[PDB]
């Protein structure tokens, strides 16, 4: 009747959670529903000019009548009932790109957040300045630590010190620091532990 579109708005919001949270980490966030929220932005516009008429007649017509007081409440309540949903969908939108912002917060060519969902990379381009304001803020949290602690990844605890790792789908020469490992195509390694953490999350090495 009134907040009806918000019900099906938060209904399709439920699908975005179960798509991501059940399958894997790979998000591919669907879309922003500007078309849908423009409808409720239209209804909130019509509802707001509805009450200022009765704000205009409350001194002249019914004279702050008890009926009119309840007539203010339905117009008051239907505002905030709509207001509850439209930010909740807004929060659950932005509370999943942070997870995209955390796991690849800068490990190998950070500002290439391109080659990534071009149909929605203009969508979240308005949110990129929000996104990069995480990224700028996450840089000084990396430097504002008084000692060098990694905050980029390595969440699973380490077990051993020698791990057989193979490679595929990659080429070139990388790893200028910690000794160059000279990555040729399709050739396994047998190395120590701490080096490959910045490359497995990078997604160049494949199997543990």
């Amino acid at each position: 009747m009134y907040g009806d579109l918000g019900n099906k708005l938060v209904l399709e919001a439920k699908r975005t959670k179960q798509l991501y949270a059940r399958s894997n980490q790979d998000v591919n966030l669907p879309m922003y529903h500007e078309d849908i929220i423009r409808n409720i932005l239209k209804e909130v516009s019509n509802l707001r000019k509805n009450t200022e008429y009765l704000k205009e007649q409350q001194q002249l017509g019914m004279l702050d009548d008890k009926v009119a007081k309840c007539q203010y409440f339905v117009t008051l309540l239907c505002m905030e009932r709509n207001k509850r949903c439209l930010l909740a969908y807004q929060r659950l939108r932005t509370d999943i790109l942070d997870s995209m912002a955390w796991n690849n917060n800068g490990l190998d060519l950070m500002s290439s957040i391109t080659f990534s969902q071009q149909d929605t990379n203009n969508l979240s381009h308005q949110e990129q300045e929000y996104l990069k304001e995480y990224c700028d803020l996450i840089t000084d949290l990396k430097s504002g630590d008084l000692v060098d602690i990694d905050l980029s990844g390595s969440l699973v605890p380490p077990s051993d010190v020698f791990i057989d790792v193979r490679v595929l789908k990659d080429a070139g020469e990388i790893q200028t620091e910690y000794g160059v490992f000279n990555l040729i195509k399709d050739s396994q390694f047998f190395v120590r532990q701490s080096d490959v953490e910045r490359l497995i999350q990078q997604g160049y090495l494949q199997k543990i």
């Binding site: 942070d98 997870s99 955390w102 969440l155 699973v156 605890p157 077990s159 051993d160 010190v161 020698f162």
Partner: protein
């Protein structure tokens, strides 16, 4: 910001708190260890015990210059007396090594081919005792009162496995009890 496994531990770090406990070895080798919790010794003498932490001894076993002694309850003639005190006592579990399940799984990777005849006997004498614990746990939760339980002897693993559901059932029923008045 993990957002994945927050309300409990993942099963890869529950071994991480138990690996930092010490046991006894039989050393072989002759500065050495300055590892801020060290007790480095001199030229170490064989045929003697020493309280050494676990995780360095597993690393000391890959290069294969030491040997491990099992703890004193890891014989088959000892575990049998545990199964009788429980089969006569359906109320609770009796006597618990407190970290036994995760201790065996580390102990079955080049820490099994050292001991005197444990194959086809020890995995027999353990996997029976896992379920006898969890058969006991199924009768216990049916007897759930409000806001008061009696778990006396549980391994750390079942505590990581009873955990993520036992909260929100009694929590959701905590509402309807309390919001009724």
């Amino acid at each position: 910001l993990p957002a994945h496994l927050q309300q409990t531990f993942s099963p890869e770090e529950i071994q991480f708190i138990v690996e930092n406990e010490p046991i006894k070895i039989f050393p072989r080798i002759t500065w050495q260890l300055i590892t801020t919790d060290d007790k480095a010794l001199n030229n170490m003498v064989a045929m003697r015990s020493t309280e050494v932490v676990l995780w360095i001894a597993l690393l000391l076993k890959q290069q294969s210059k030491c040997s491990i002694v099992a703890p004193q309850w890891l014989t088959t003639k000892e575990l049998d007396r545990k199964i009788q005190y429980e089969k006569t006592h359906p109320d609770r579990f009796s006597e618990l090594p407190w970290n036994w399940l995760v201790l065996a799984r580390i102990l079955f990777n080049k820490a099994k081919d050292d001991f005197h005849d444990p194959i086809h006997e020890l995995r027999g004498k353990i996997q029976d005792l896992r379920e006898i614990r969890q058969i006991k746990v199924l009768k216990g939760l049916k007897y759930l009162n409000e806001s008061h339980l009696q778990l006396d002897n549980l391994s750390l693993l079942e505590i990581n496995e009873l955990r993520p559901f036992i909260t929100e059932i009694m929590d959701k029923l905590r509402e309807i009890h309390t919001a009724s008045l």
